[PDB]
RNA sequence: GGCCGCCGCCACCGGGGUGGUCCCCGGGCCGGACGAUCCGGCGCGCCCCGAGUGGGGCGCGGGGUUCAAUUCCCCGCGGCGGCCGCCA
RNA sequence: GGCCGCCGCCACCGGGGUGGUCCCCGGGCCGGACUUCAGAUCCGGCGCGCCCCGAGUGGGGCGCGGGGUUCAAUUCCCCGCGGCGGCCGCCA
């Protein structure tokens, strides 16, 4: 069906650009997609202020969440922390939708250069620190491993990428658990095991004979799971008797 | 406090531009303000589709709503219908905040000119019809009356506008027994008048009789409906 | 990136049990005796034996307890995860 | 923009009620009743208009937009004037 696309990468690596191109392709593919990012709101404020961020984070997540109920969502954001990427995944987990992390990278070189061409709104010094404190996706959690790693300096086959994503959208997202396909059959197993250990201690057996006692139980148990009705007490005696006449 | 500023005007009249300016000024005035408009989300879609509108509307209102809890909010939208403007007011009504409608005007001429300059993404034909069906703010409801009417063709004193708004933000947003005796006695009198067909002079007395009785009772502290109503009926029968 | 938790380190995969030199359930695969069925088996390393096919022995991160450790204790490696680090 | 509607025209202001000649509740003011002052108390009252009497100061008549159902209209109905709203129309 539809899925959540999480982007991750340092400022200026080309995330927003990426989003719009990827978004157009996906459209041509008859896929309703929307690009959401914290900036949408953050930049709706004439000025920036630390106190705004709480609201911004909350407002952004709400959009993604409500948007993910009906459309493909490409999250255009830094997500330089893994716990952020997690938060975004829990949204897809919540609506049981497939999710794909796309990590865009580029050498600090290209980043500093592009930031200078932007007026250096964000001090080069910051860009440098972020590059260092950035959480390499996949390095800590397997759920964090990137479905793709894109190098914005080289070409990009948006058609191939769109193809791969669509195919993953069709897969089954197993976020938590499943079952595929008793007590008495089990109690006989456990008990016979203890009985065999008792017999082995009372006869001070050697390696050779013990292996027969073990095979003796194996044969015994096989003969029993063939019989329909069985009683713990009864069987356990037939076993002890079998061991005594060994 | 903080208030909800509603913008209204045809596409290209200068709404978004207006918002950014008004927001900057309000900022220097130590006021936390945010600019929100349906376009924010609509344009987050690579292409446009009728079915997106529902989400776009709902998602936008949610933002304005959650934003108006902590910040001033300038709604940058066309809102060419009054029912739309109302729906935004209901938000301010909900949080009991002041609201100010700002109508941006411009001759069809300036609009068509500006639309051409934008690539005419919106066919001129459309701009023309929207102009012909733009609900003139105030024309139907007093609550719709514009706090201001701005002509984007002439200059704009953002400092003056900012001052007026601030001042309006400070204004205040607006948004038994004795009775039962009166009612019943009235009924009793109508009943008595039906069962005896009195004369003009006579009924005038019955009415003055109730008048005097009622006055005598509003003097007594404790009273019981059932009880007094009986004393009245008895007084009626003994006259 | 910091803190902490669960698990694996018995050897086809998954799940589970267990002081027995492993075992049970499901799946897969291989071989032998007879075509389905019956029976046996399954990884890596090292060593011995056989002209060869093949057969057999030893071991399974380090150490402790024990007749015996996959299991129980301490340590080491690894797998997975949780919380938080939040325009940067 | 389309469709539907509410309130006032009882009379200090606002809300409301009720076929009883009006009233109920809150506000404001004026005055009477207990003051040097001030938070308070109970109680009478409060608008508009046309005509007349004060040979002086005040009081008297009647009406409360037009008509109808009525013994009685503030109330119920039709219209007028005055004030206000609801739903919907939705990139456009
Ligand atoms: N594939 C690309 N190759 C070269 N330059 C690119 C590419 N994509 C984007 N750019 C340019 O790199 C600069 C930043 O791109 P942008 O998409 O804004 O990055 P971003 O990560 O979204 N930035 P930010 O939102 O601040 O984190 C602009 O000059 C883009 O035009
Ligand atoms: N005060 C102004 N005087 C003259 N031109 C203006 C003014 N304000 C804005 N413009 C120009 O008018 C064009 C559109 O302005 P814009 O602010 O986008 O209007 P809008 O109503 O927000 N448009 P839309 O979002 O499509 O409804 C741009 O060229 C603006 O620069
Ligand atoms: Mg960006
Ligand atoms: Mg605009």
Tell me the domains of chain A and their CATH numbers. Answer: 4-171 (3.40.50.300), 182-246 (1.10.12.40)
Instruction: Judge whether B74 and B36 are in contact, CB under 8 Å.
Output: yes
Query: Cβ B46–A24 below 8 Å, yes or no?
Result: yes
Phi, psi of A86 (to 5 degrees): -65, -55
Would you list the DSSP string of chain B? ---EEEEE--TTSSHHHHHHHHHHHHHHTT--EEEE-THHHHTTSSS--TTHHHHHHHHHHHHHHHHTTTSEEEE-S---SHHHHHHHHHHHHHTT--EEEEEEE--HHHHHHHHHTTT-SS-HHHHHHHHHT---TTSS-GGG--SEEEETTS---HHHHHHHHHHHHHS-----HHHHHHHHHHHHHHHHHHHH---HHHHHHHHHHHHHHHHHHTTSSS--HHHHHHHHHHHHHT-
Window 107-126 of chain B: CB closer than 7 A to strand D: 121-123, 126
- Of residues B64, B76, B63, B89, the one with CA closest to residue B19: B76
Is the distance from CB of B35 to CB of B17 less than 8 angstroms?
no
Burial of B29 (0-12, 13-18, 19+ CB in 10 A): middle
> What is the helix (H) or strand (E) element at residue A36, kind and residue range?
strand A33-36
Technique behind the model: X-ray
Report the C-alpha gap between B1 and B73 in whole angstroms: 12
Using alpha carbons only, what angle is made at residue A42 by residues A113 and B90, rounded to the nearest 5 degrees? Answer: 160
Q: Token match 């220097």: residue? A: B28
Ramachandran bin of B157, using left for φ above 0, alpha for ψ from -120 to 50, beta for the remaining angles: beta
Helices (H), chain A: 15-28, 38-42, 50-67, 82-94, 108-116, 124-133, 158-170, 183-202, 207-224, 232-244
Instruction: Please list, in sequence order, all residues whose beta carbon lies within 8 angstroms of the beta carbon of residue A32, skipping any fewer than 6 positions away.
Output: A2, A70, A71, A72, B45, B49, B52
Query: How far off is chain B from A95, nearest CA to CA, in Å?
Result: 17
**And the tokens for B11?**
């596409």
Q: Which of B80, B81, B101, B137 is nearest to B3 (CA)?
A: B101
Dist CA A67 CA B107 (whole Å): 38
Residues of B with CB under 8 A from a CB of A: 20, 23-24, 26-27, 32-36, 40-41, 44-47, 49, 52, 55, 58-59, 62-63, 66-67, 70-71
> In terms of residues, how long is chain A?
246
Q: Which residues contact A121 (CB under 8 A, 6 or more apart)?
A: A115
Alpha carbons B231 and B236: distance in angstroms, whole number: 9
- Protein-covered nucleotides of chain C (CB closer than 7 Å) are 1, 17-26, 39, 67-68, 79-88
Contacts with B27 from chain A: Cβ below 8 Å:
46-47
A109-144 exposure pattern, b = at least 16 Cβ within 10 A, e = fewer: ebbbebbeeeeeeeeeeebeebbeebbebbeeeeeb
Rg of chain A on CA atoms, in Å: 30
**Rounded distance, CA A29 to CA A162, Å?**
8
Q: In what order do the strands lie in the sheet with A3-8?
A: A33-36, A72-75, A3-8, A98-105, A148-151
């Amino acid at each position: 069906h539809h899925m959540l696309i999480i982007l991750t990468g340092l400022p200026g690596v080309g995330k927003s650009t990426f989003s719009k191109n990827l978004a157009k392709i996906l459209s041509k593919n008859n896929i309703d997609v929307i690009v959401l990012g914290s900036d949408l709101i953050r930049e709706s404020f004439p000025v920036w202020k630390e106190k705004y961020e709480e609201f911004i984070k909350k407002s952004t997540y709400r959009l993604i969440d409500s948007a993910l109920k009906n459309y493909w969502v490409i999250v255009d954001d830094t997500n330089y922390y893994n716990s952020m990427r997690r938060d975004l995944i829990n949204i897809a987990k919540k609506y049981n939708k497939n999710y794909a992390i796309i990590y865009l990278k580029a050498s600090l070189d290209v980043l500093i250069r592009r930031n200078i061409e932007r007026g250096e709104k964000i001090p080069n010094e910051v860009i440098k620190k972020m590059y260092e404190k950035f959480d390499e996706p996949g390095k800590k959690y397997k759920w964090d491993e990137p479905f793709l790693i894109i190098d914005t300096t080289k070409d990009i086959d948006f058609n191939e990428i769109a193809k791969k994503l669509i195919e993953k959208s069709k897969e089954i997202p197993k976020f938590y658990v499943l079952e595929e396909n008793n007590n008495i059959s089990d109690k006989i197993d456990k008990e016979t095991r203890k009985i065999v250990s008792e017999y082995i201690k009372s006869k001070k057996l050697d390696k050779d004979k013990i292996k027969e006692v073990v095979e003796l139980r194996k044969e015994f148990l096989k003969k029993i799971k063939k019989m329909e009705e069985v009683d713990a007490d009864r069987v356990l005696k037939e076993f002890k008797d079998l061991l005594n006449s060994y």
